[PDB]
Structure 1
Amino acid sequence: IPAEFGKPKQTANIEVGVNLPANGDLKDPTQFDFSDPDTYNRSTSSTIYDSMGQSYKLTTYYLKDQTQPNTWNTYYTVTDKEGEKPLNVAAGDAQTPTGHVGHTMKFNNDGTLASLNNGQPITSVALGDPATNTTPVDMNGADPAQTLNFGLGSATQFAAPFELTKFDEDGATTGFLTKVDFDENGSVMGTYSNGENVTLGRVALVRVPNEQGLDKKGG
C-alpha cells in the first residue's frame, strides 16, 4: 500500500459530452479565428496534465457550420506561459485558410450523434514536436510526443442551450495516501489527494477440499 501516487500520468484520453444549440446563429467556416470571439459560437476551457505533471489550459472552440445544416466545427488550442497555440487534428476535415485543423460533427434528424470527423477517430498531433506541429507547445521538459484522444460519443444537438454535461480525463498528478477501505470482493482500494481511486490489489483466498486433514502449525 504505497503512501504516494508517485507517477504523474499524462492525459491521453478526454471524454467530452455536450449539447449543442440547434437554434444558434450560423458562422462562416473560413472566417474562424480563436482570437475573435464573434467568429465562432462557444468556447470551453479545461485543464490537462503532461508527462511531468505540469498543468496546461485546454480551450475548445465550437463553430456552427453555415453551408451545411446540422454540422459543427470543433477546434482546440493550448495556452502555455508563452501564449495560446492552436492544436491541429491529424485527419480532421476542417482546414481554415490560416492553417488550423479542426474536425467536423454531424447529427441525425432526431438530434442524436450521426458522425464524427468522417467516421475517423479524433487524435491530435504531438504537442511539442516541431516535426508534426507548426505551433509546438512548450513542454518545459515534458514529453513532446504527447497525444490526446477525444471521445465525443455522447454529443447531441437539441433545442436546449449550450451545455457541458460531462467532462472526463485520464490525467493524474502527484498525491498522498488519504484513506484506505476494503470492498466485499476483497479489493483494497485507496484514494489519494489527486483523486484517482487506485486499487492496490485483492486479498487471496484459499480453500482445501478436506479441511479436517490440515496439519496444525503454531499461531
Structure 2
Amino acid sequence: IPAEFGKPKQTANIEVGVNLPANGDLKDPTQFDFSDPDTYNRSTSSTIYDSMGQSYKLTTYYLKDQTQPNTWNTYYTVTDKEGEKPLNVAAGDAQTPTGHVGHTMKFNNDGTLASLNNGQPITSVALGDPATNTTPVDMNGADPAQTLNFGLGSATQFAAPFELTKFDEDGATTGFLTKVDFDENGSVMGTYSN
C-alpha cells in the first residue's frame, strides 16, 4: 500500500497573469542581480515538478525598465540544493552583463499589454542540460532536457499595486495515502491527495 501513488508529469506550460505597478520606482536593467532585492521591484515564488516527481522552487523576478517607459524586465531562477541557479531564455531580448537572460514586457498607455519578447514565444533553455545552460539544474537523474513554456498574454500594468492574479500549471507530483478501505471482494482501495 504505497504512501505516495501517482504518475508524475513534468512541468511544460506555465501561465502567469500579473499586474505590474505603474507607480513603482524605475530600475537599472544592467544592474540586475537576484542576490540583491533592491535592484528589482518584485519577486514571486512558484513550485515546479520534473519528470520523476521532484519538487523544485521557481522564483520569478520583475524589474522596471528605466531607459524605456512602460517596459519591464523579467528573470527566472530555479532553486536546487546547491543554491539559486539563474534560468536563461534562449531568445529573450533582455540581457545582463552577468549572463542572465530575461524577457522584456511592453505595455500601452491605457495599461494593456503591448508586446512580449519582441513577438517571440517564451521558451527557456533545458533545465539540466549543461551543454545549453551555464547553470545546469541538478535534476537527480530526471530528464535533463526539460524545457518550460511561459504564457503571459494577459499580463497588465495599471495603477494598482503588484498582484499575482492567476497562476496555472500542468505539473503533478504524486499522491499521499489518506484513507484505506476494503470492499466485500477483498479489494483494498486507497484514496490519495490528488
Same fold by TM-score greater than 0.5: yes
Counterpart for residue 115 of structure 2: 115
Shift of 1:172: 0.2
Shift of 1:184: 28
Q: CA RMSD in A?
A: 5.3
Structure with greater contact order relative to length (CA < 8 Å, sep ≥ 6): 2
Shift of 1:6: 3.0
Change in CA separation of 1:19 and 1:175 when aligned onto 2, cut-off 3 Å: same
Question: What CA distance in whole angstroms lies between the structure 2 residues aligned with 1:86 and 1:183?
Answer: 51
Change in CA separation of 1:2 and 1:84 when aligned onto 2, cut-off 3 Å: closer
Question: What CA distance in whole angstroms lies between the structure 1 residues aligned with 2:66 and 2:37?
Answer: 17
The secondary structure found in structure 2 opposite 1:139 is: coil
Change in CA separation of 1:4 and 1:77 when aligned onto 2, cut-off 3 Å: closer
Change in CA separation of 1:53 and 1:4 when aligned onto 2, cut-off 3 Å: closer
Shift of 1:108: 1.0
Change in CA separation of 1:191 and 1:28 when aligned onto 2, cut-off 3 Å: farther
Question: Deviations 1:36-68 (Å, cap 9, x if unpaired)?
Answer: 000011001011000011000100000000000
Shift of 1:139: 0.4
Change in CA separation of 1:118 and 1:176 when aligned onto 2, cut-off 3 Å: same
Change in CA separation of 1:17 and 1:3 when aligned onto 2, cut-off 3 Å: same
Q: Unaligned regions of 5+ residues in structure 1, if any?
A: 194-218
Question: Deviations 1:92-115 (Å, cap 9, x if unpaired)?
Answer: 001100100000000112111111
Question: Deviations 1:180-206 (Å, cap 9, x if unpaired)?
Answer: 99999999999952xxxxxxxxxxxxx
Shift of 1:2: 14
Q: Which runs of 4 or more aligned residues in structure 1 lie more than 4 Å from their structure 2 counterparts after TM superposition?
A: 1-5, 176-192
Question: What CA distance in whole angstroms lies between the structure 2 residues aligned with 1:114 and 1:105?
Answer: 8
Q: Any residues of structure 2 matched to 1:21-40 within 5 Å, and which?
A: 21-40=21-40
Question: What CA distance in whole angstroms lies between the structure 2 residues aligned with 1:3 and 1:188?
Answer: 14
Moved more, 182-191 or 112-121: 182-191
Question: What CA distance in whole angstroms lies between the structure 2 residues aligned with 1:79 and 1:32?
Answer: 18
- Percentage identity across aligned positions? 99
CA contact (8 A) 2:55 2:173 kept: no
Shift of 1:153: 1.0
Change in CA separation of 1:45 and 1:182 when aligned onto 2, cut-off 3 Å: farther
Change in CA separation of 1:192 and 1:97 when aligned onto 2, cut-off 3 Å: same
Shift of 1:171: 0.3
Shift of 1:24: 0.4
Question: What CA distance in whole angstroms lies between the structure 1 residues aligned with 2:42 and 2:130?
Answer: 29
Question: What CA distance in whole angstroms lies between the structure 2 residues aligned with 1:10 and 1:131?
Answer: 21
Change in CA separation of 1:187 and 1:139 when aligned onto 2, cut-off 3 Å: same
The secondary structure found in structure 1 opposite 2:123 is: coil
Give the total of aligned pairs. 194
Shift of 1:90: 1.2
Shift of 1:154: 1.0
The secondary structure found in structure 2 opposite 1:158 is: coil
Question: What CA distance in whole angstroms lies between the structure 2 residues aligned with 1:26 and 1:93?
Answer: 19
